[PDB]
Amino acid sequence: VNSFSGYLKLTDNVYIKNADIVEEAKKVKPTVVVNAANVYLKHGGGVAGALNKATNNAMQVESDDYIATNGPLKVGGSCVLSGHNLAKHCLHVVGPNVNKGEDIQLLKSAYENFNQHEVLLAPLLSAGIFGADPIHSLRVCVDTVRTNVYLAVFDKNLYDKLVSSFL
Numbered sequence: 625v626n627s628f629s630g631y632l633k634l635t636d637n638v639y640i641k642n643a644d645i646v647e648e649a650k651k652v653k654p655t656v657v658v659n660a661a662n663v664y665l666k667h668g669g670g671v672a673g674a675l676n677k678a679t680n681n682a683m684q685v686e687s688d689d690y691i692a693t694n695g696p697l698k699v700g701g702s703c704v705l706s707g708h709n710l711a712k713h714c715l716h717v718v719g720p721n722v723n724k725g726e727d728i729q730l731l732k733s734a735y736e737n738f739n740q741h742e743v744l745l746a747p748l749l750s751a752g753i754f755g756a757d758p759i760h761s762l763r764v765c766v767d768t769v770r771t772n773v774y775l776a777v778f779d780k781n782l783y784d785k786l787v788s789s790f791l
């Protein structure tokens with residue numbers, strides 16, 4: 625039994641809610657919140673900008689030190705950093721940004737990072753401003769992640785679309 629509540633059960637291991645991932649994190653304080661990152665960990669807008677804003681820019685400060693030491697992530701890759709005031713840990717996962725020309729086949733690789741954590745609060749990778757088909761991303765999530773994932777879908781109309789079309 626965990627602290628996630630009000631989520632629709634989609635599958636044996638995937639739950640979904642129409643909610644802002646930032647607000648869910650402050651309420652639940654999960655062990656792991658997933659950030660929809662870019663390879664440079666530049667958290668300017670979208671999910672990343674919103675999480676970072678909620679950390680008072682501490683996420684960005686930590687991320688800049690990480691990049692200075694380690695260089696950029698790979699598309700499809702991840703790193704574990706602090707969750708600051710939102711979670712114990714933040715798993716920064718880079719899904720392909722279709723609006724940047726990044727290959728959509730890497731979405732499965734991106735979701736595989738979730739399997740290293742028993743329970744996660746996570747956004748729909750590559751959806752929204754990342755430019756990929758959100759129905760497809762959900763199919764990849766359900767077909768790739770085996771650990772317990774709680775998905776927070778921000779856009780109300782998107783959420784309604786995803787539930788009503790889920791196979």
Ligand SMILES: O=C(O)C[C@H](NC(=O)c1ncnc2[nH]ccc12)c1cccnc1
Pocket residue numbers: 644645646660669670671674747748749750751752753754776777778779782
């Ligand atoms: O679920 C959605 O609608 C799409 C989701 N977007 C957000 O979660 C989001 N976007 C902008 N501002 C925000 N503030 C708090 C949350 C948030 C998303 C998923 C993957 C990549 N980029 C975006």
